[PDB]
Structure formats: structure tokens, C-alpha cells
A paper describes a structure:
Particular hotspots for the mutations are the angiotensin converting enzyme 2 (ACE2) receptor binding domain (RBD) (15 amino acid substitutions) and the N-terminal domain (NTD) (3 deletions totaling 6 residues, 1 insertion, and 4 substitutions). Mutations in Omicron knock out or substantially reduce neutralization by most of the large panel of potent monoclonal antibodies and antibodies under commercial development.
We then determined the high-resolution crystal structure of the Omicron RBD domain in complex with two Fabs: Beta-55 and EY6A (Huang et al., 2021; Liu et al., 2021b; Zhou et al., 2020). Although the rearrangement in Omicron is quite modest, it is exactly this region of the structure that undergoes a larger conformation change when lipid is bound into the pocket. Changes in the serine-rich loop allow the attached helix to swing out, opening the pocket for lipid binding. It is possible that the increased rigidity and the entropic penalty of exposing hydrophobic residues may disfavor lipid binding to Omicron, which would alter the properties of the virus, explaining the selection of these changes. Beta-55, as predicted earlier (Liu et al., 2021b), binds to the right shoulder, around residue 501. Interestingly, the epitope includes several residues mutated in Omicron from the early pandemic virus (including Q498R, N501Y, and Y505H). It is remarkable that despite these significant changes, neutralization is relatively little affected. The neutralization result was confirmed by measurements of the binding affinity, 177 pM and 204 pM for the early pandemic and Omicron RBDs, respectively.
Numbering used by the authors:
A (entry chain E): 333 to 516, 524 to 527
B (entry chain L): 1 to 212
C (entry chain B): 1 to 214
D (entry chain H): 1 to 135, 142 to 221
E (entry chain A): 1 to 228
Amino acid sequence: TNLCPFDEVFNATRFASVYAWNRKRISNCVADYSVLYNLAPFFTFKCYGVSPTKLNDLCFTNVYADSFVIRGDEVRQIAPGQTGNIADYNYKLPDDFTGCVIAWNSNKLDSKVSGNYNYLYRLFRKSNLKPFERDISTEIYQAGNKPCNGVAGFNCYFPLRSYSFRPTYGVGHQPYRVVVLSFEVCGK
Amino acid sequence: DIQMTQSPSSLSASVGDRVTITCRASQSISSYLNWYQQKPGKAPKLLIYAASSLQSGVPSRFSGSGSGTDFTLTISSLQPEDFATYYCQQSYSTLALTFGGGTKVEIKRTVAAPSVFIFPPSDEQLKSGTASVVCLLNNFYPREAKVQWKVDNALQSGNSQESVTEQDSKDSTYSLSSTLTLSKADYEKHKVYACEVTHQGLSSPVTKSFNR
Amino acid sequence: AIRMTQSPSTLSASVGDRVTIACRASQSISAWLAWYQQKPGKAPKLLIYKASSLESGVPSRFSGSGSGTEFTLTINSLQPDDFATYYCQQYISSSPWTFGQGTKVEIKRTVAAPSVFIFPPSDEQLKSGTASVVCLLNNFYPREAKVQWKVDNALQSGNSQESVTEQDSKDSTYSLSSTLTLSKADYEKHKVYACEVTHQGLSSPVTKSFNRGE
Amino acid sequence: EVQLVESGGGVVQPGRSLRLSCAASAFTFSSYDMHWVRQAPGKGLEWVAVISYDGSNKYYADSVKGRFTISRDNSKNTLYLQMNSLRAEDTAVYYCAKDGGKLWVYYFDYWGQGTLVTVSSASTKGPSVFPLAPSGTAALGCLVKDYFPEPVTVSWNSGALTSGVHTFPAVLQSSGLYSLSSVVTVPSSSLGTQTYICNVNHKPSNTKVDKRVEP
Amino acid sequence: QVQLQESGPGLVKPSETLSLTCTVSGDSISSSRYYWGWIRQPPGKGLEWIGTFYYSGITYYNPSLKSRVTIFVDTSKNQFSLKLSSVTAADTAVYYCARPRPPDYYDNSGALLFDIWGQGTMVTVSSASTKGPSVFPLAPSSKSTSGGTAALGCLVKDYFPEPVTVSWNSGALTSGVHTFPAVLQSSGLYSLSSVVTVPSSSLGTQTYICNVNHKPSNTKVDKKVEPK
Ligand SMILES: *[C@@H]1O[C@H](CO)[C@@H](O[C@@H]2O[C@H](CO)[C@@H](O)[C@H](O)[C@H]2NC(C)=O)[C@H](O)[C@H]1NC(C)=O
Ligand SMILES: [Cl-]
């Protein structure tokens, strides 16, 4: 329809892993920001370089909607100027980021009794990510001097790990669905 | 949250001087830095917004500069009504607005030693069960001053409360009062009550005491 | 499935003693081990979590330690109220066989001879066709006790059942009741009924008796 | 020209609720975002909440989220802050601030004089005024102890004595009460010949005490 | 403070479905913010975790209990249920409803412990019919007298299934009371006794009533015990 498809991003049945975060390009549509941004207190909502109460008045070239899942203690990393394994190796925002970050506890959707090992994050990388860079490579990381030749072993680790989201975990280990809206689509 | 660190915490100056305050951000906040002025007992007042834009009605002797993490507020010529506390506030994180710790622009004067006085508890009060010993530091500069309660040559901690006046409108001096509070039972257990005072204007620490 | 092993299964300790209960895991459970106290006729009560963290409202004399595969529960200054069965539970993973088999802690106390009472069947039960004779052993220690039903000096067997209370949480004693159930006809055939009691606290066997009709 | 006047502040027990108001004038109130900023006694400034110009979007600081509620009535030009479940850490002077609106981000360009909100479990008790007798000038004063809540006004000789008078900020002692000192340095010669009377007034309890100080 | 209380039938026929209900009571507490589970204990045996309800569609069931376990939480009524189908004699046990303790912020355990429990309900899987008990008096006499104290009591005989609760003088008399566990008679019916020791000088002046309650048959009996 005429409205911007923010429904297909926030309400998607499955979210992407943070190391392979999805991006949705949103252009040439009308958005009801104030209505869809009027979130309840159980939402983590932080905006940068722009006020939420002014988005219904501005127009932008494009609005990128990035979505992924991390654990609760890593939500603070989804912000400009942050460091850590998620901000450096998985999803890096620029220092002059203009947009909003939305997060909510999704323990009832992404955690499994036997463990939801489906969500992954990158643990090792030779250098940090550039802003908005996506690295889905899983080549055997060489932490030493001997070449790995794609073979696992000593000083040669698989660069990815799993979250294994279980409902019995504490909030710091519970899954959180994250949507990052980048502004550079008129609000109405 | 983004931490805003101001330096110095306090600086002394005189009318006509050029004052320069610094404000640092824990991360790049682009140019969304705002400066506010606050006098004691009054609300803050906006001086600069967006790092360098002068608010309407503010004297042109105020100015700001810097971008990223290092910012500066400058008063080209200090006037008598500019002695106040100044705060920076970042607006890059719009839903997590944070202020700096503040910077106090006090009146610069010569070093003055405090006049130390000690007051034993009154007879009217001791009948209530509590004993309050009051030690007074009168008219000193600068504000940095240590007050140490000795009781029978035993240093007292965590049982007194300090209070300091604003910089005096007359001689630009400060004054301090510390109150040692202990019960009546604790009050007869000892005899000597002293008050050691360390200050920049004292070549050696000064003590005023009394015998119960 | 990780199997938990408690040792010992039963123990007897004096008041004021230092009790120690070991719990062993077939594989490392880090420190995700809990300790429970279950008093008779009550739900289990959580004492320890994370192997060593004490729950709110639990006396300080309880303590737990251990990591990996072997864990230890300690009861300093054992109180008579501490008579219970204690369970360790791993919770590293949701799997079968999560609780240990349990350790039953009995309170050791001084020998006390039982107070013996005998009850003839009531008229209401006799007018229903059956006759039950109840022998009572009240407040004794230790638990071991022997009750022999004699009917006209004929030792009886196979026509009676016994029941022992759990240890009392105040004086640490036990109580026993043996019921001799007979048909009203067979009860009407004999005169003297008696239970003979032997116990560590009785230098002599005690025998309470009654005569049908007196 | 902008005018902001707060009201509704006072004393409140822990866990209770209090509601503030902020009447605005001399600007188009319905086209500017409004803010609340609090400041603890002797501490810095802490942003509290913001509401959109029309009142449809509201956002709060984490220290008050799910606890405070902001609203506005554009027909009365009044801002509100419903404060539920008030902790001792909520004791502060609460300012309402207008947003400048000239930037893509928020900033406060005009502040009200604020209103004091004291969260404590103590009821209004009058002060006990104790003298501080002297033992090359002399010093004497009064000790205003055990009163709640702030403030107390202390004058000497009904305002006739002001030179050389120091009245110190009060302190919050462990008993939940306030203790305050007032002193004056007088010539040492005229000591047993001049009368010095501190005038203590506690409006919350209506206690006007005049105590004579003499060696 | 949260309080749990089981409620369900004490007797279930073989191959039927067991159905219990635990009601969460507290200070305006929402059961939507906690997990709820069930734990059973066969008589004379250890504890078995049956399963826990976390969210709708995210439940754990003991794999040894196959596909016959179902747990549902009603967050508007603040009570949850247990469904156990195809029951056998191996399912006769005391059943507890429990609340797994909410984990701390940094906890990463794959299971949890249970910090709040109910009182437990005894479910017996059997083909036999319910039967209320006959309450007979154990009158105090010279043979049941030791010095200045005398013993009296009640014989609760021929009932099924467990349990029965016995109190004296409506709970006003608790000191010196001994209610023994029930013995399973050869007839298949349970039978227990409950005694109390009283001073001999009170036998003719104080009335003593035992209060037997057999919930499975909705049978309450108040039996006065007098010296014969
Ligand atoms: C995602 O779907 C949920 C429903 O699952 C939508 O939630 C509703 O939102 C409206 C406001 O737009 C409320 O009035 C309803 O009460 C909500 N219902 C439920 C069940 O939550 C939500 O709006 C959707 N979000 C998007 C971006 O499409
Ligand atoms: Cl189990």
C-alpha cells in the first residue's frame, strides 16, 4: 500500500543473525513515524543526530532499515562510537550516525528450551568493521603464524559463535530484536 | 550515556580577564554542544547552542568553538555579572541528553587564612540526648580547606557534616562550618574535643580545642 | 542427562554437630547446583543456589561449596528442627534425572523408653462386624522397636500392621501404633489380648493387656 | 520575553505520587517541544522527559522511565509531569524548559525558576534553636537543628545586624532531618554589653523562635 | 509474597488423563512475568521434574514422560494447569506446582531451580472406587493410662484413596498429637490412627473431638472421644 513497509521489518517472523544483518531499503512512500515510534516503556529507544518528535516533518533521500538479533548485554553496543565484539566485528555505526535504534526483548520468540543455536555472531576478525559494513565470511581465522589452509586446529579458530538462546537465561543473555533506522520518504 | 567532562572544575579570574572553559565528550557528538550559565539560587540560562551559535540577547563577549569531542567556551572580557557556574550539554544523543559536571568562575583575590572557632554543645541541647560540636572556618581563600575532628587524639570519620557558603559578595571569601554529632553516651566517654584545620594560608595546621 | 549422586544416603548426627553432605555429578555442571530441604509432609524448600549462594530467609548455619563435579552442603550446629531429607539439583541443562536421590538426616538423641498403651475395639466398630485392637508406643528413641501380639498367650503373626511417625522436630522421638484387626467372631472367641514391647530403653519387656468384658 | 512558571512542588513520602505544572506565556506554546529537567541539591543537571508540540510523542530518561509521565494542555498553555513511585533519589528542583526548535536536536533555550520536590518519610517538625556562645575579635551564632523540611530563614536583631553574618547551607543528617548554622563575627570588646538575638523562622511548621546569645 | 496452591482430583482411573490446577496468589502479581512448572514425587522415592511453562510455544517436558504432558498458563486468571494422559500405577505420586526462580542478569544456565512451591496434592491412579472412612474412638482407660497422663484417639479405617487430614478440637489441640501414616490393608483400603496424650484429671471435664476430612469423598466427620 501507500504506507512504508515498516510492518515487514518490525513484525518479521524470523530475524537475521547480527554478523549477517539484514538491510531493507525504504523509498518513495509515506510514513506515520509518530504513530509507529510511540512505543511502550518495554522498548529500548535511542535516537542520534535527530529528534523523534520531528521526523514527521522531515524528508530524506533514503531510509535504511537494518535488523538483527543480539543478547541483552550487547544492546548498548548498537550506537555510534561504541566498542566491543558486536560493534567492531558485526555491526558498526558511524560516529556521525543520524537515526534511531530500537530494541525489545524477544525471549518469547527466539529462545528455545533445547537452545536456539540458530543465531550467530562473529568472535574473531583481523581488523574492525567499517561503518555499515557486512562481513558474512567464515574463513578460518589465523591467530598465529602458521597458515590454516581452511583447516581448523591450533591458532586457527572458526570465527563464528552461537548465542544458544534458552528461556532460562538471564536478561543479559536473552535475545533482543534490533531495528536500526538510518535517515539521510516524507513523514506524515 | 555520553559522558561530558569539564575542565577546570573551578577557575579564579578578575574583571577584564579572558576566560576559557573546556568541555570534552566521551565520543564524537558532532557539533550539538550547548553552554548554559547558572547563578546560585537561579535557573540556568542558555548562552551558546550548536557549539558556536550565540543565543539571542546574550552579550557578544561569549563565544564557542570546536567540533567532535573537544569544545571551548570563551569570555573575551570578564564582567562582574559573568561570575557563575557554566555547564555544557550534548544533544547528539537526543533521547539521552547529558550535562557536564560544571565549571565555577569565581572571583580571584589574595590568600586569606581562616579564623577558626569551636563551639561546645549548649546546656539546653545536652538535655535532649545528642551532643553537637561546631567548628567554624571564617573568611578564607581559596575554598580548598580540610577539617579534621580529633577526640582524645583519635581521628573522627563518618560522624560530622560540613557546609560552605558561597563566595562572599564583600571580600570574596568562603566560610565553612562542620558539625560533629554523637550521642550523650559517646560524649562522656571522652574529654578533649579538637578541630584541626589545614589551609593554603596556614604555614602549619591550626587546631582549636576545649576541655569538657 | 546428567546423574547426581548424594553420599551418604542416610546419616545420624547429634545436636550441635557439623553435618556434611556430598553431591557428585557425572560431568561438570560448573556451579549451577541447588540444595533443597524437605521436611516430612512438606514441599521441598530451596536452601542454596549457585552451589554457594544462600536463599533469603535461610539460617546462616547452612552453607554450600563446590565446583565442577563434586559439591558439598554443610550444616553447622545441627538443630533438632533440621531433621529432613536433603536434595541436590543440577540445573546446567533441562534434562531428565535432575535431582539427587536425597540424604535423610536423623537427629541423634538420648535413649528414651516408650510409653505403652493398648486400646480395645470400640462398640461402634464391634457393631460393624470387625474388631481392631490398637497398641501405642509413644515418644521413644531410637526408632527400632518390636511389638508382639499375644492372644491368650498365643503369639500372633500375619494379622497386624505397624506404623511409625517421622522423627519429631522438637524432642527428636518416634511413635508407633500396631493394629491387630480381627473379625468380631474370632475376637469373641478369646479373652486376654496383649502387646509385648521391647526397646533399648526398657530393661524389661512391657506388656499392656485387657480382658474382653472387663 | 518567554515566561515559564512552575508550581505543585512540595514534600512527599516514598512511594507516593506528586504532580507538577508549568504555565507558559509569550510564545506559541503549541508549536514547541517541552522538557523537564531536575537538579539535586548541590548536584548537576539531569534531563527528565520531553513531549512533542502536539502531545502525541513522549520520551523519558531511564532513571524515571515507567515511573514518571509527561503531558500538556495546549488550550491552557500548561505542561504537566505526573511523578509516581517517588524515591529519595528523586529529591530535586524540577525545571520546565522550552525547546529552541532551531536545530534537528533538542536544546533548552528558556527555563522556569523551578519548584522544589522533597521525597522523605519525615513529617513537618519545627526546629530546635541552640546557642553557640563565644569563649582579635569574637564569634557567636545559632545552631538550627532537627527541622523538616527546608527552608528556614535566620536573621540577627530583626535585620539590624547583617554585616559579618554568615548563614550556612543546611545538611541532611541520618535522622532524615535538617541541621543549619548561622554565625556572626562581632567586636570582642562589646561582648557582655551588646545583645545578639538570632531570629529563626520555619514556615512549614510556623515556628518563629528568637533566642538570645550571650557568653 | 507469591503463594501457590494445587487443586485436583485425588483419584484417576488407569489410561485416563490427569488434570491439576495451581492458583498463583500474590500482591497484584502477573503470572505473565514468571515461569511455572510441575514436580512430582512417588511415595518413598525421589523428585522428578515434570516440565515447565515459559511462554506459549516454549515449554519443556520431561522426555521420559513422552508425549503425554501438557502445561497451560492462564495469565488473566493467574493459574496454570497440568495434563498427563495415559496414566498408570507408575504415575501415582504427590504432585507439586513450583515456580522456577527468575535468573539473575548474567546467569546463563540451561535450566533453573524452583524457589517457590505449592503444598502438594496426592493423585492415586487406580481402578477402585472412592470410599469414605469410618471413624472409631480409641477411648482412654486404665490400660491407656501412664501415671497422670492418659491417651485417647481416633481410628480412621477403610478409606480410599489417600489422604485424610486429622485435627483435634478444630486445631486448638496440637501439642502431644500423633497422626500415624496409613497402612494399606489386605482389602485394598487404607487405615490410620491419630492419638493425643492428655492429663488424666481432664478426661471427664474436657471434650475431645477428632476432625477427619477425606477430600476425595467429600467426607467430614467430627467424632467425640469419651472414656468408656
Ligand atoms: C506489528 O504487529 C503488532 C500486532 O502483533 C501491531 O501491534 C498493534 O499496534 C496497534 C497500534 O498500531 C495497537 O493499537 C494494537 O493494540 C497492537 N496489537 C498488538 C497485538 O500488539 C503493530 O502495530 C505492528 N507493527 C508494525 C510496525 O506494523
Ligand atoms: Cl527429573
